[PDB]
Amino acid sequence: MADYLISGGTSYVPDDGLTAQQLFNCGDGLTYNDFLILPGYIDFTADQVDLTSALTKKITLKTPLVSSPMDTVTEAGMAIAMALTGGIGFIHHNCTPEFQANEVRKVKKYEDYPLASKDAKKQLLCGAAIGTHEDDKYRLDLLAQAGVDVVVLDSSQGNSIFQINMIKYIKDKYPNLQVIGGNVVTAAQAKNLIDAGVDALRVGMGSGSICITQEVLACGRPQATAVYKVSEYARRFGVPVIADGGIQNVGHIAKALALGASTVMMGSLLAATTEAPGEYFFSDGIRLKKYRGMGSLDAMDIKVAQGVSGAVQDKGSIHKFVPYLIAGIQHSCQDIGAKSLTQVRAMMYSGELKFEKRTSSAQVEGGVHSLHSYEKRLF
Amino acid sequence: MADYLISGGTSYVPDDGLTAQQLFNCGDGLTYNDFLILPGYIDFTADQVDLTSALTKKITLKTPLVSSPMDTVTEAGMAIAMALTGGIGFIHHNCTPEFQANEVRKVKKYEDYPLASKDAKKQLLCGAAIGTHEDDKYRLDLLAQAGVDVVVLDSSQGNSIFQINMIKYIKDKYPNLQVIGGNVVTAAQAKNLIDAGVDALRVGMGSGSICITQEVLACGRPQATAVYKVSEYARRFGVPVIADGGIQNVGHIAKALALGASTVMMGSLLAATTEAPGEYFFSDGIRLKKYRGMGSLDAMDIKVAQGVSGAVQDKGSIHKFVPYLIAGIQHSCQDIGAKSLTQVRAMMYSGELKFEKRTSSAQVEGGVHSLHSYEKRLF
Amino acid sequence: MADYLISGGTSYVPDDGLTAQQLFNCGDGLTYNDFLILPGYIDFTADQVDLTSALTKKITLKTPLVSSPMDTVTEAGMAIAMALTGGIGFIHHNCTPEFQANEVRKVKKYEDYPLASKDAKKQLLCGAAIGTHEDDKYRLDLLAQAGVDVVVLDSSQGNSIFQINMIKYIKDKYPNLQVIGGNVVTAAQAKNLIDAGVDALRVGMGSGSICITQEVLACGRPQATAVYKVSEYARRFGVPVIADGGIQNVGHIAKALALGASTVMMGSLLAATTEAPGEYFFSDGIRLKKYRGMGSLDAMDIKVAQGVSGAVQDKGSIHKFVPYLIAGIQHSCQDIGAKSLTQVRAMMYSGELKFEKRTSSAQVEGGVHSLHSYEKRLF
Amino acid sequence: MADYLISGGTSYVPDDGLTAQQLFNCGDGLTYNDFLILPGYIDFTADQVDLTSALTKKITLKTPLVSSPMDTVTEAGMAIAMALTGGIGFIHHNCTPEFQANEVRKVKKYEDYPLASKDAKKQLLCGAAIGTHEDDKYRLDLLAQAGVDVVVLDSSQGNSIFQINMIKYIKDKYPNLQVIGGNVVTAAQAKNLIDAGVDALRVGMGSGSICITQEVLACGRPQATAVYKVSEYARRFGVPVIADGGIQNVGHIAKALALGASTVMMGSLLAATTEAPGEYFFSDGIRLKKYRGMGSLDAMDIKVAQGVSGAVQDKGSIHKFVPYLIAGIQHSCQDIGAKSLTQVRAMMYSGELKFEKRTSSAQVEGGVHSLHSYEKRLF
Ligand SMILES: Nc1ncnc2c1ncn2[C@@H]1O[C@H](COP(=O)(O)OP(=O)(O)OC[C@H]2O[C@@H]([n+]3cccc(NC(=O)c4cccs4)c3)[C@H](O)[C@@H]2O)[C@@H](O)[C@H]1O
Ligand SMILES: Nc1ncnc2c1ncn2[C@@H]1O[C@H](COP(=O)(O)OP(=O)(O)OC[C@H]2O[C@@H]([n+]3cccc(NC(=O)c4cccs4)c3)[C@H](O)[C@@H]2O)[C@@H](O)[C@H]1O
Ligand SMILES: Nc1ncnc2c1ncn2[C@@H]1O[C@H](COP(=O)(O)OP(=O)(O)OC[C@H]2O[C@@H]([n+]3cccc(NC(=O)c4cccs4)c3)[C@H](O)[C@@H]2O)[C@@H](O)[C@H]1O
Ligand SMILES: Nc1ncnc2c1ncn2[C@@H]1O[C@H](COP(=O)(O)OP(=O)(O)OC[C@H]2O[C@@H]([n+]3cccc(NC(=O)c4cccs4)c3)[C@H](O)[C@@H]2O)[C@@H](O)[C@H]1O
Ligand SMILES: O=c1[nH]cnc2c1ncn2[C@@H]1O[C@H](COP(=O)(O)O)[C@@H](O)[C@H]1O
Ligand SMILES: O=c1[nH]cnc2c1ncn2[C@@H]1O[C@H](COP(=O)(O)O)[C@@H](O)[C@H]1O
Ligand SMILES: O=c1[nH]cnc2c1ncn2[C@@H]1O[C@H](COP(=O)(O)O)[C@@H](O)[C@H]1O
Ligand SMILES: O=c1[nH]cnc2c1ncn2[C@@H]1O[C@H](COP(=O)(O)O)[C@@H](O)[C@H]1O
Ligand SMILES: [K+]
Ligand SMILES: [K+]
Ligand SMILES: [K+]
Ligand SMILES: [K+]
Numbered sequence A, B, C, D: 001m002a003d004y005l006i007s008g009g010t011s012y013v014p015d016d017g018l019t020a021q022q023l024f025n026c027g028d029g030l031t032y033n034d035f036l037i038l039p040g041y042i043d044f045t046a047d048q049v050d051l052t053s054a055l056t057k058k059i060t061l062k063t064p065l066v067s068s069p070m071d072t073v074t075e076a077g078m079a080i081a082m083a084l085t086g087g088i089g090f091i092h093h094n095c096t097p098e099f100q101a102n103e104v105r106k107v108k109k110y111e112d113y114p115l116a117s118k119d120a121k122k123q124l125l126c127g128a129a130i131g132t133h134e135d136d137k138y139r140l141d142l143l144a145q146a147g148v149d150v151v152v153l154d155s156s157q158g159n160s161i162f163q164i165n166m167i168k169y170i171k172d173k174y175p176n177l178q179v180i181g182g183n184v185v186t187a188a189q190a191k192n193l194i195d196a197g198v199d200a201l202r203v204g205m206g207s208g209s210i211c212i213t214q215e216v217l218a219c220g221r222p223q224a225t226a227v228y229k230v231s232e233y234a235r236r237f238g239v240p241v242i243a244d245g246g247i248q249n250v251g252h253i254a255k256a257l258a259l260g261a262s263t264v265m266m267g268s269l270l271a272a273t274t275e276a277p278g279e280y281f282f283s284d285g286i287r288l289k290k291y292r293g294m295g296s297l298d299a300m301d302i303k304v305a306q307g308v309s310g311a312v313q314d315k316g317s318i319h320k321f322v323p324y325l326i327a328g329i330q331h332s333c334q335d336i337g338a339k340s341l342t343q344v345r346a347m348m349y350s351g352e353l354k355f356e357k358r359t360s361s362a363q364v365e366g367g368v369h370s371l372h373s374y375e376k377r378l379f
Helices: A076-085 A097-108 A134-145 A161-173 A187-196 A213-217 A223-235 A250-258 A318-335 A341-350 A360-366 B076-085 B097-108 B134-145 B161-173 B187-196 B213-217 B223-235 B250-258 B318-335 B341-350 B360-366 C076-085 C097-108 C134-145 C161-173 C187-196 C213-217 C223-235 C250-258 C318-335 C341-350 C360-366 D076-085 D097-108 D134-145 D161-173 D187-196 D213-217 D223-235 D250-258 D318-335 D341-350 D360-366
Strands: A035-037 A065-067 A088-091 A127-130 A150-153 A178-184 A200-203 A241-244 A263-266 A281-283 A286-292 A309-313 A355-357 B035-037 B065-067 B088-091 B127-130 B150-153 B178-184 B200-203 B241-244 B263-266 B281-283 B286-292 B309-313 B355-357 B373-375 C035-037 C065-067 C088-091 C127-130 C150-153 C178-184 C200-203 C241-244 C263-266 C281-283 C286-292 C309-313 C355-357 D035-037 D065-067 D088-091 D127-130 D150-153 D178-184 D200-203 D241-244 D263-266 D281-283 D286-292 D309-313 D355-357 D373-375
Touching: A035 A250, A065 A076, A065 A318, A076 A088, A076 A097, A076 A318, A088 A097, A088 A150, A097 A134, A127 A134, A134 A161, A150 A161, A161 A178, A161 A187, A178 A187, A178 A241, A187 A200, A187 A223, A200 A223, A213 D250, A213 D318, A223 A241, A223 A250, A250 A263, A250 A318, A250 A341, A318 A341, B035 B250, B065 B076, B065 B318, B076 B088, B076 B097, B076 B318, B088 B097, B088 B150, B097 B134, B127 B134, B134 B161, B150 B161, B161 B178, B161 B187, B178 B187, B178 B241, B187 B200, B187 B223, B200 B223, B223 B241, B223 B250, B250 B263, B250 B318, B250 B341, B250 C213, B318 B341, B318 C213, C035 C250, C065 C076, C065 C318, C076 C088, C076 C097, C076 C318, C088 C097, C088 C150, C097 C134, C127 C134, C134 C161, C150 C161, C161 C178, C161 C187, C178 C187, C178 C241, C187 C200, C187 C223, C200 C223, C223 C241, C223 C250, C250 C263, C250 C318, C250 C341, C318 C341, D035 D250, D065 D076, D065 D318, D076 D088, D076 D097, D076 D318, D088 D097, D088 D150, D097 D134, D127 D134, D134 D161, D150 D161, D161 D178, D161 D187, D178 D187, D178 D241, D187 D200, D187 D223, D200 D223, D223 D241, D223 D250, D250 D263, D250 D318, D250 D341, D318 D341
Parallel strands: A065 A088, A065 A263, A088 A127, A127 A150, A150 A178, A178 A200, A200 A241, A241 A263, B065 B088, B065 B263, B088 B127, B127 B150, B150 B178, B178 B200, B200 B241, B241 B263, C065 C088, C065 C263, C088 C127, C127 C150, C150 C178, C178 C200, C200 C241, C241 C263, D065 D088, D065 D263, D088 D127, D127 D150, D150 D178, D178 D200, D200 D241, D241 D263
Antiparallel strands: A035 A355, A281 A286, A286 A309, A309 D373, B035 B355, B281 B286, B286 B309, B373 C309, C035 C355, C281 C286, C286 C309, D035 D355, D281 D286, D286 D309
């Protein structure tokens, strides 16, 4: 009958809101806080949401969470905790190659965690970072001998001849080793690195909490727009994206995933956790832990500093914080009417998922307001 | 793996062309010849295309073809042929009520045609037209006694209190009789008639081959835009649309169906057929049959004429012409990558189906050109 | 000094006109006659212009001219003449496989023409057309045994599972045989065929002089826009384009090449030439030769005709007509300030080359006007 | 082959971001902090970047850095240091003509610095400022007798008959003396001054750190837009531009140079340096030096004040600060993929260089955020 024959029985949907393509075609240079995702239809419970994510072409994780390769964020303990909770961690390289290899070995030889990320031998997955310099090759070798599963080329500007040469060298010498390229914020850089043969991209420049690259070199891009554009280009070749930098809350993670990113990497949000490197200290009755950019003078100690050093308040253990992030992501997916992150991205690329801009007054309204005092308890 | 997890395994589609919503949002006042449908992907043969169409809320036809209720187009013979070939015909009402009832009876009592349109009693479906005047009520009664399955309220401007009153009267006295309202070209008229309780809409004003309403009363609308807008509004309430007027070739039928119409009604294209009323004559060696608008002075014989009278060249029998139209529609559906008209409309409403405008030079290029002489043989 | 340091010594260029990207982003559905190329700077003579063109990934021609695979256009003689003059011809397949193979053999065994197109063995290059049906495979084999250098899959709508399967079969059985896919007018079809592994694309649908596909199936695209879009997509993967259909004069060839096409294929312009198949006849004192679409009822003799049959006036020998086209293309390149077609396309993609739209009055002004009578002698 | 013939072998570049022309055609009134430069491709080291810049038509500097002619910024010592480090300084004129001439003489008679800016006699380059009043002529004479190499006409609004008359007088009496006109923010003012015969333009009004002209007289322009527009007009006649005012960090210098400026002049950034005039003092444990606008009541002591007076924190010696600025500019050039500032401007005018807007949230993200405390050490 006509009820089905007119358009296939699918009840029409009133057109309200903007698609991601429309939102990011205005050239406004948007970030996470500049927009919201409109709600959809709910016919499932939050606990049924699947957060399985692809870190690289061949590596798949049960959660989209990744720890940044920073000397104040990720060491063997942080990597072990992230792998157990369903994510992965990248060991920093501001150390001797032997120390990094030893940390990787500690991660690999570690012995309920149903979501634990493991390799074919039931060993916890581990990542590591290397540079684009000649010495890094030796470092890579040691990391290869320690059983590292994936390596990320660490650089503020990854579209360089040095990085392409290193990618080709790695692929020739270690064909089975997954390689992540970055950082990039434009489609041209992504094209160059994908042609080089990378298995994933790391997207972000200037958005880091401890980053001052934008005001020093005038180079960067708003995080949300960069994520959207790079993910849209990379999806044409089946290359996943890691949104790196600018993450402050679960909402940012959900927005990054909805815009095309397959994984999200956080430095500050995981900083000051128990598993993070360093020891807690006290200042004015507040418990804090050090957190610094790898380009800050302290980290590298004419030198042009690209980062700052400071402190972050204690957040507890990873084993309690990560489940909260997982629950928040699941609830966001339920609110937008998606049973999986893959479905979220499919809806966004198909135009089903709708977005809306936020004015400054809209941002004020969205946050806490009109209260004499209040306390915020996330969980 | 990433090949499926990024967006669900559906290979991305480059964005090329305009959606129907984009095409008809420019306010250019487009007709059929002003645009083309872009080709898609073929993974089936043309003969598998299903042309099942909904004439009304409860009446379904195996073909989308309908014959206009005109004194030079549709009588008992034309209706019988159209029903046998898979369509339906509406008996004109420029005659006594008894004559129209007798024609309806002839259609109903008629005794391989696999696509034949039949009612629950295996009797050929038949339609009829009535006016919005007091006398028409009596006419309707006779048509009801003859077994008519559907009635169309014939008027150049159907958004009138008289038509709404007649619709309510029919629904009260004949609850099981399907009623078609029209003609309308705007969403407001469609809203009024749908609220009245019509089972289908007849869309078109000024586009008829024998119509001069636009130049006499300055009232009308381009056919393609009217079809799109009225169909888009009516789909919200499950009300099918009959695109009436302006059809000159199979391409026009395909375009009308793709823009939202569930059926297409033709007066001139079926004129001069063997089953059409009247007798053939000869002029300058050309075999012709009369064809006139119901608003022309001849048809109604101060009077304001809204149509003209003339002649149309012979086209043969319906039993050979209609199969050609069916084959052409199937081939168009295959070219645009749809296995059914329902799928065509679903794709158009979902944005998958793409369109492109045509400049005057584009129209010239599309037609036959750069030939000293030629002969056109459709089939 | 400042004369060079400000911007590198390159004198600034006033911004006047539109780039191709700007021109074809308006969604107006433009054809060749709807726009003009603005002149540039001349610092060379016309005879220095290089017309070297890439027919496929591995086949390069000294001229961009190709003869269509039509039963009234290209046979052994036409192919031989085109190869000698610097182009190439594709043997039609509306014949027995043995006849086509014999024509290919005649072309291959033919024994000053400095621009002659030859293979590694100094044998004239020859192309042939095949269908996407099961029988065509056998045909292909014979064409392979006759020494054909390139094969084009002939279809009005080339984005089909059948064509992809045939492409894969050819690449598996004949890895060294160049394959041309088509016809396509959108970037999605081009993506599918390029992923299948074609070596070149054939772009055009509805623009043929003897084509009525647009009015019968409502499917097609304006030629210029299709050429631009498909060429822009294909250039990303190094796949050349053959603009097919709608060519009436040298200006159209130049426009097609400037919009991204690597070669141009003409059916009507080369029709009625001495080397074309068939015999001349006389009508009202005019010497004409037959020319028909391969989809016309005559060519294939329910059948849905997609072409017409007619006659075209005599044009002389190919050996005199082709040099005129070469000279005209060279003069157009000189006028737009390019020493080669490669440079033309580089300028167009870089935005240096500028275009302007043409109104109908502009088209009238561009043509001959305000004369009581005149005679047009091209050369 | 096709790899090179299609477009010349240059791999296509995905279109991402806006050109400067597109960015500044929106009429949004942008400043430095409102946009970012997108990264490019790196195939060289930062130390190979050439910062050679044209101060005027005939004067070329090895660095684009200039010191403002202010009584709290530039005296003989500051000029000597700037010339030694590769820039130049302009002696202020809020003093007796004899004092200014003596300072110029001190600069000229000063006796490793490979980048030192020297004249044909191996004497350090020196600039000076004069007004548009009758007395200034005498001042000019003394400055001419002291060996000044370039003179800048100091005025908040340089498009005046007085300034044009002074320019003509200088050119008539001192044909070989380079003259800088300003200040201007629009293309009409630039046209007038260029027609007068200036050798360079000084661009800025309302952007100074100590300037309140915008709120007092309602006259001014955002700095970035003014720089872009004036530079674009001046480049047509080979006239360089000095971006004056609004510089707070290296990123601002890089942005100003990328938008068309040939040199950058800073008052506040060089204020409180050791070579700056005045003596350090202490306030609340902070070491500060005075810095005031030349239009402030203190500087000129009804009077309409156009500037304010205050203090700036100590920054150290010029010989250490300037190298940091040079290194930062080089790193920015490397990040955007340019080996020289000339190449940067050529890329920007050709559209190769891309830009992106910044929302307020984008600005917040770009800066330091999400830290309990931190310390910023530039170098
Ligand atoms: N084969 C090569 N031959 C010759 N020349 C080469 C070669 N390869 C690169 N160059 C050039 O030398 C410069 C150096 O810069 P890179 O080594 O590329 O690191 P970087 O730019 O990210 O940070 C800046 C400083 O931070 C310190 N640090 C330590 C550990 C980790 C990080 N990670 C990050 O900060 C970020 C990651 C993601 C977003 S930020 C930073 C270190 O001291 C750096 O110098 C460039 O010009 C380059 O082209
Ligand atoms: N209860 C009512 N009480 C009082 N006043 C009423 C009432 N009801 C309507 N009026 C008003 O009287 C006028 C008459 O006009 P209608 O009867 O509505 O027919 P119409 O406007 O289509 O054509 C015009 C003339 O053609 C002749 N004719 C004969 C047979 C069929 C057609 N079909 C068509 O032509 C078309 C169909 C689709 C596109 S064209 C035409 C006839 O002689 C007409 O007068 C209007 O003002 C109206 O409001
Ligand atoms: N393996 C397969 N198994 C099953 N079903 C298949 C398979 N493969 C395709 N089908 C389907 O059967 C139909 C047939 O159509 P095709 O063979 O694709 O040719 P076509 O559509 O271009 O022209 C139309 C008619 O012209 C005649 N003719 C003869 C020689 C050359 C041409 N060249 C052209 O005209 C043009 C070239 C460029 C622009 S026009 C035409 C012939 O009689 C045709 O039937 C389609 O539905 C298709 O999907
Ligand atoms: N031949 C002439 N005959 C007759 N009338 C003339 C003639 N020439 C100009 N007038 C008119 O008299 C007024 C005076 O104004 P100017 O002398 O043009 O200086 P100014 O407007 O920049 O600053 C304002 C006050 O600051 C004090 N001061 C001292 C030293 C340096 C500066 N430099 C700056 O501040 C800036 C530079 C770049 C951006 S700001 C300022 C001084 O006391 C000023 O009066 C105008 O109306 C004018 O048309
Ligand atoms: O020193 C630095 N300068 C600039 N960016 C940095 C530096 N150190 C780390 N980053 C980047 O900023 C990210 C930290 O993001 P966040 O802490 O979540 O805001 C890291 O994962 C790196 O991509
Ligand atoms: O006399 C008339 N004046 C105006 N419209 C008419 C008249 N007669 C019929 N029509 C309409 O025009 C249609 C004919 O369309 P066509 O003959 O396919 O061009 C009919 O089905 C009516 O909707
Ligand atoms: O019968 C047909 N129907 C539709 N298109 C055709 C037919 N025959 C040839 N063509 C196409 O039209 C082209 C002829 O272009 P033209 O003769 O230069 O205008 C051929 O090369 C085919 O691509
Ligand atoms: O008193 C003033 N009122 C307005 N502008 C001034 C005044 N003094 C200096 N300026 C301008 O402001 C610039 C200082 O820029 P900044 O200190 O880098 O922010 C100088 O080079 C002059 O162009
Ligand atoms: K709120
Ligand atoms: K045509
Ligand atoms: K003309
Ligand atoms: K930041």
